[PDB]
Design an enzyme around this catalytic site. Structure first.
Site, short mmCIF file in Angstrom:
data_model
loop_
_atom_site.label_atom_id
_atom_site.label_comp_id
_atom_site.label_asym_id
_atom_site.label_seq_id
_atom_site.Cartn_x
_atom_site.Cartn_y
_atom_site.Cartn_z
N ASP A 179 -38.87 -69.47 0.63
CA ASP A 179 -38.92 -69.14 2.05
C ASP A 179 -39.58 -70.22 2.90
O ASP A 179 -40.21 -69.93 3.92
CB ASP A 179 -39.64 -67.79 2.23
CG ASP A 179 -38.87 -66.63 1.60
OD1 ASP A 179 -37.66 -66.78 1.36
OD2 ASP A 179 -39.47 -65.57 1.33
N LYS B 115 -40.26 -79.38 -11.89
CA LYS B 115 -40.05 -77.98 -12.27
C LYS B 115 -40.64 -77.30 -11.06
O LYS B 115 -41.80 -76.89 -11.05
CB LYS B 115 -40.86 -77.60 -13.51
CG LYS B 115 -40.60 -78.46 -14.71
CD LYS B 115 -41.70 -79.53 -14.82
CE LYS B 115 -41.65 -80.21 -16.18
NZ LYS B 115 -40.38 -80.99 -16.34
N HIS C 9 -37.42 -84.97 -13.29
CA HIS C 9 -38.41 -84.20 -14.04
C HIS C 9 -39.15 -83.01 -13.41
O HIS C 9 -39.83 -82.28 -14.12
CB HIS C 9 -39.43 -85.21 -14.59
CG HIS C 9 -40.16 -84.73 -15.80
ND1 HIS C 9 -41.47 -84.28 -15.75
CD2 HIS C 9 -39.77 -84.60 -17.09
CE1 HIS C 9 -41.85 -83.90 -16.95
NE2 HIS C 9 -40.84 -84.09 -17.78
#
Lengths: 152, 152
Positions: A100, A95, A93
Site C-alpha cells: 500500500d 526479498k 537478490h
C-alpha cells in the site's frame, strides 16, 4: 504511527509475519524476489489480487528456472497478476514486499519453503513509513522496468 | 527518535550505509552472516574493535569454506574479535548487524563484494528501536550459542 515487526525462521514467526503483510494489503503490493516458490506465499498473493489489490511482481530470472519456480510463476500469471523476470543483474537478490505504498517487508527471508522451515532467517515489516516505501518503490520500479513479462 | 535508512546495490548506497552502521558503533556489534568475505566490511569491524567496541560474530559454517571466507575469518579472528561458525541450520541465512543494542541493520545484502557491486540488493538500518534490537539479539544469541569458535 510508524512501527516495526520482526519474525524468524525456522521458528515460524517469519513466515506468518510475511503472510500477515500480504494479507494486510488493501490497495497495492509491489514485490521483488530472488527464489520464487513458496506455495502458501503464492496463495496469499492471488487472494490479495482477488481482494482487488493491485499486485505486480518482478523476480530474478536465472534463479527461477526450476520446476517449483515455474509452477509458482504459472499460478501467479494464471491469476492475472502482472509478473516479470529480470536478468539484468547477476542476481536480482532482494526479498521485498512493498504494501500500500507505505509499508515495507524485507530481510533475508526468500519466498521458499526452505526459508520458511529450515534456514535461520529474519523478516521485518516496517509499517507506515511513506518516505521509506516510496524510496523502495523506485528500487522496485527500476528493476520491473527492465524485466520481461511472464504471461499465461 | 526511531528512524530508518535504506541503501541499494549495485547502486553503491547499500555498502556505504552498512559501513555507516558499523562506523557508528560506540559500544557493541552483534553480527550474523551467511557469506562472510567483503574486505572493506572486515576492515570496518576491526576498526570498531580498535575503537573498543564489543564485537562478536556468528557466521554460516558450510557457506564459508572458500578462500576469501577463510582470509576474512582469519583476519577477524587475528584481531581478537570473538567469531563462531554455525552449522546447525542448513543455512544460517541472516545478514544482520545489531549495533549498540538499539539499532539493527538487515536486508538481502550479504557481506560480499558481489552484494556490494553486482547483485541488486537492499540494506536497511533501523535506528534506535531498543525493543526491536533486543528481539534480534535473542535471535543472534541463540545461533551464537550453538556455534563453534574460530580462533587465531
Amino acid at each position: 504511527e510508524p512501527s516495526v515487526q520482526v519474525g524468524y525462521s525456522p521458528e515460524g514467526s517469519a513466515r506468518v509475519l510475511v503472510l500477515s503483510a500480504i494479507d494486510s494489503a488493501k490497495t497495492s503490493i509491489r514485490m521483488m524476489a530472488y527464489s520464487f516458490t513458496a506455495p502458501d506465499i503464492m496463495k496469499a498473493l492471488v487472494a490479495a489480487k482477488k481482494r482487488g489489490v493491485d499486485v505486480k511482481i518482478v523476480i530474478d530470472e536465472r534463479g527461477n528456472t526450476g520446476r517449483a519456480s515455474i509452477a509458482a510463476m504459472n499460478y501467479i500469471a494464471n491469476s492475472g497478476i502482472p509478473l516479470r523476470t529480470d536478468s539484468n543483474f547477476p542476481i536480482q537478490h532482494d526479498k521485498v514486499i512493498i504494501v500500500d505504498n507505505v509499508t515495507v517487508e524485507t530481510g533475508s527471508f526468500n519466498f521458499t519453503k526452505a526459508a520458511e522451515t529450515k534456514n535461520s532467517e529474519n523478516a521485518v515489516v516496517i509499517w507506515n513509513m511513506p518516505k521509506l516505501a516510496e524510496s523502495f518503490l523506485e528500487h522496485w520500479q527500476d528493476r520491473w522496468n527492465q524485466g520481461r513479462d511472464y504471461r499465461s
